[PDB]
Amino acid sequence: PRVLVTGALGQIGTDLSLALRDKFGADSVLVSDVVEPGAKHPLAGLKGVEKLDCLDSNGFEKLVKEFKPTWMYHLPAIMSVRGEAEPDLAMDINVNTTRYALELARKYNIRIFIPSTIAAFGDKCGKTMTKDDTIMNPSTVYGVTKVYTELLGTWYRQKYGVDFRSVRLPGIISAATLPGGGATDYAIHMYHSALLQKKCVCPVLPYESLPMMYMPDTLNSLVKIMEAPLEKLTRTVYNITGFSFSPSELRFSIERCTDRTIEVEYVEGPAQKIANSWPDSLDDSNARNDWGHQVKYDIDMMSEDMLRQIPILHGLPSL
Amino acid sequence: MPRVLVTGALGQIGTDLSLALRDKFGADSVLVSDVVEPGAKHPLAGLKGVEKLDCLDSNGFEKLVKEFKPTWMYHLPAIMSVRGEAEPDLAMDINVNTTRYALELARKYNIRIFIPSTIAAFGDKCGKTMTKDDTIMNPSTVYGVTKVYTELLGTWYRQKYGVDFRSVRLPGIISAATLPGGGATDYAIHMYHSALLQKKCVCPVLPYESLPMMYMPDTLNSLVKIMEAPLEKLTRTVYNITGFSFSPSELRFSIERCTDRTIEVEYVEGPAQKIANSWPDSLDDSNARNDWGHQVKYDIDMMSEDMLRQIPILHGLPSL
Numbered sequence: 043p044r045v046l047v048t049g050a051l052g053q054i055g056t057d058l059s060l061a062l063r064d065k066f067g068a069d070s071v072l073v074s075d076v077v078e079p080g081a082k083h084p085l086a087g088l089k090g091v092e093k094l095d096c097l098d099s100n101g102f103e104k105l106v107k108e109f110k111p112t113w114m115y116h117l118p119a120i121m122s123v124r125g126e127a128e129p130d131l132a133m134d135i136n137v138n139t140t141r142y143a144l145e146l147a148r149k150y151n152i153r154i155f156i157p158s159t160i161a162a163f164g165d166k167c168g169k170t171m172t173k174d175d176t177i178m179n180p181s182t183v184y185g186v187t188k189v190y191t192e193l194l195g196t197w198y199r200q201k202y203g204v205d206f207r208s209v210r211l212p213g214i215i216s217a218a219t220l221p222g223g224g225a226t227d228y229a230i231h232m233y234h235s236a237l238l239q240k241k242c243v244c245p246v247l248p249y250e251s252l253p254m255m256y257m258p259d260t261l262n263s264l265v266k267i268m269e270a271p272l273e274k275l276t277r278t279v280y281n282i283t284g285f286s287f288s289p290s291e292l293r294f295s296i297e298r299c300t301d302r303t304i305e306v307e308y309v310e311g312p313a314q315k316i317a318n319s320w321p322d323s324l325d326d327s328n329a330r331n332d333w334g335h336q337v338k339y340d341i342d343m344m345s346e347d348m349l350r351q352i353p354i355l356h357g358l359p360s361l
Numbered sequence: 362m363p364r365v366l367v368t369g370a371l372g373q374i375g376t377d378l379s380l381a382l383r384d385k386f387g388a389d390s391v392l393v394s395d396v397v398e399p400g401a402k403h404p405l406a407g408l409k410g411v412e413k414l415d416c417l418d419s420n421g422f423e424k425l426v427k428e429f430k431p432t433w434m435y436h437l438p439a440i441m442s443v444r445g446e447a448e449p450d451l452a453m454d455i456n457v458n459t460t461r462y463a464l465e466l467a468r469k470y471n472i473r474i475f476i477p478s479t480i481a482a483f484g485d486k487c488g489k490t491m492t493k494d495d496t497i498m499n500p501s502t503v504y505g506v507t508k509v510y511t512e513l514l515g516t517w518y519r520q521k522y523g524v525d526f527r528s529v530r531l532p533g534i535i536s537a538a539t540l541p542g543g544g545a546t547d548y549a550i551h552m553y554h555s556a557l558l559q560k561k562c563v564c565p566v567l568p569y570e571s572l573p574m575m576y577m578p579d580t581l582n583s584l585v586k587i588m589e590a591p592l593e594k595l596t597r598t599v600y601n602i603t604g605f606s607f608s609p610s611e612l613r614f615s616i617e618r619c620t621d622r623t624i625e626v627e628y629v630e631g632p633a634q635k636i637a638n639s640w641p642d643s644l645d646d647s648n649a650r651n652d653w654g655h656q657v658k659y660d661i662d663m664m665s666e667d668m669l670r671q672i673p674i675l676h677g678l679p680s681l
């Protein structure tokens with residue numbers, strides 16, 4: 043198994059690149075992104091890290107000819123909040139990079155994973171335990187580009203036999219990457235605020251529940267789906283979930299683990315109208331039955347690990 | 362009176378729509394455009410307000426919009442379902458990129474913009490009988506895929522920027538003015554030609570494959586009416602519409618009534634069959650009916666009468 047990763051230096055890529063390196067060995071894994079890893083970044087100095095802009099189809103093909111992958115994880119995308127503000131970049135990146143990856147997957151017989159997202163759903167999905175097949179009316183361009191990713195991948199599978207595999211990831215929580223202005227990124231902010239003992243200004247409303255998953259469960263699942271025999275897969279795109287929580291549910295969790303009250307004021311920002319159009323929870327029975335998707339962390343296990351790791355990885359005050 | 366721009370105008374839909382808009386609103390208020398120039402027997406040859414514009418040329422597309430200042434736009438170019446399976450790269454280039462440019466232009470210059478979708482946007486999980494406006498969409502062609510994209514992108518432009526994006530999922534459209542090509546629903550137009558010529562029709566769709574269809578006069582009344590409707594009457598951006606549903610053998614019987622003779626039709630399955638089979642047999646268009654008055658005058662025999670009489674006149678095929 044020779045594994046190419048594109049968009050490999052962001053939140054998912056960082057940890058997935060290390061996980062795959064450890065399992066199949068550094069010589070069987072090639073990691074690429076349009077930027078280079080910074081000095082403090084976990085993949086710096088390592089070899090088998092390349093620069094590739096996936097918008098350059100010929101460059102893309104060049105790397106694939108040379109490395110001869112049997113597997114590819116295609117991760118570059120502009121996500122829900124950023125996309126609303128830079129839609130042109132969203133459409134370019136999410137539509138065209140994906141187009142080229144699937145064309146290379148067809149031509150060089152690569153098994154290709156491209157993640158979708160709960161942002162592919164909108165307010166007609168059926169908000170409670172959303173099924174794998176339902177109405178898709180996303181309210182963000184990111185979401186729109188991901189419905190397209192899903193349909194087009196599945197068409198490549200039917201038409202050419204391309205082994206296209208995908209999951210709808212819930213919001214993903216990890217320690218290793220600092221927090222942005224993204225929709226589910228408030229969770230990652232509250233951990234940091236609690237460690238610094240500062241005011242958390244949470245843009246998502248206190249009782250807005252969302253499906254979420256902690257990264258080690260995400261890594262197990264992204265490898266497991268791709269190791270599975272094709273024969274076992276009754277579909278190309280699967281909901282997976284970890285657990286649903288609201289920001290008040292997260293604040294509690296963090297208080298139980300720090301034995302100290304933390305400071306949260308809830309003032310809505312752009313993430314709230316977005317999150318509200320998403321499902322509260324997913325039905326992932328198909329992923330469970332077909333290829334063994336499973337979850338070992340609950341919200342309190344995750345907080346304990348997050349409150350330990352953040353001080354180690356970014357020097358915030360330990361607990 | 363609106364100022365209407367039509368892109369993709371020389372094709373099957375464009376030809377008859379362009380003429381209708383010219384009649385109704387004045388030739389002065391209608392600009393139409395296409396990547397090629399019209400050939401001399403084309404109904405739009407020799408007419409004013411007919412330009413050459415490649416919609417993949419964003420700069421060029423913008424320049425014409427700037428000069429003309431439309432208030433409405435019908436953005437028609439696409440690669441359709443049978444051709445798209447064979448030329449997928451072209452389908453994705455046309456169907457995605459021109460659409461993107463159109464919407465940006467609609468936003469930027471305040472255009473009410475119509476972009477047709479299709480029954481081909483549905484697949485075999487849609488609910489095959491009397492399919493709803495809102496249902497599972499799992500199209501089994503790249504065209505279908507790009508049209509789901511078009512539906513959702515346009516909708517997002519309505520929500521995010523206030524763009525008055527409007528659309529319908531057209532069924533198989535039947536018209537006489539345009540010579541039939543290789544597409545799925547076009548077996549129907551060929552069968553009218555084979556009958557006037559008294560030649561074999563080798564049909565690549567299987568005889569009992571029912572599909573939603575509509576006759577051009579009705580589709581024209583609907584295309585104009587959806588665009589005249591005031592925005593507050595529209596409960597949604599994308600509407601199903603149909604005329605009536607028929608299979609190849611139904612169409613053959615209907616031609617045989619009018620000709621009072623037998624046609625020869627042999628069924629040899631082609632690539633149109635699998636595609637067509639994944640589409641709805643019929644659609645629920647109640648929302649379109651209630652919201653903006655979508656209505657239908659022709660049935661299959663009114664349609665055959667008119668096709669068999671019109672094709673000779675328009676194209677010199679043997680009469681009656």
Ligand SMILES: NC(=O)c1ccc[n+]([C@@H]2O[C@H](COP(=O)([O-])OP(=O)(O)OC[C@H]3O[C@@H](n4cnc5c(N)ncnc54)[C@H](O)[C@@H]3O)[C@@H](O)[C@H]2O)c1
Nearest residue numbers: 049051052053054076095096117118119157159211213214
């Ligand atoms: N993190 C989440 O909570 C989450 C949730 C659901 C789905 N996903 C999906 O997982 C994938 C990865 O998400 P992430 O959280 O790692 O995002 P991220 O923004 O953290 O990482 C994205 C990486 O893509 C790179 N990139 C941008 N343009 C590129 C280009 N033209 N060529 C090559 N690389 C380019 C960026 O430099 C960055 O390293 C995306 O498709 C995303 O939609 C993520």
Ligand SMILES: NC(=O)c1ccc[n+]([C@@H]2O[C@H](COP(=O)([O-])OP(=O)(O)OC[C@H]3O[C@@H](n4cnc5c(N)ncnc54)[C@H](O)[C@@H]3O)[C@@H](O)[C@H]2O)c1
Nearest residue numbers: 369371372373374396415416437438439477479531533534
């Ligand atoms: N005809 C049907 O039964 C049917 C059904 C459903 C939806 N539609 C939609 O209606 C639209 C028009 O269909 P049609 O049947 O008239 O198609 P057609 O193929 O007959 O006509 C297409 C026209 O678009 C033009 N074109 C191609 N590339 C172009 C470009 N880059 N810039 C400008 N023009 C370009 C072609 O020259 C042609 O004149 C399509 O979006 C189609 O999906 C048609």
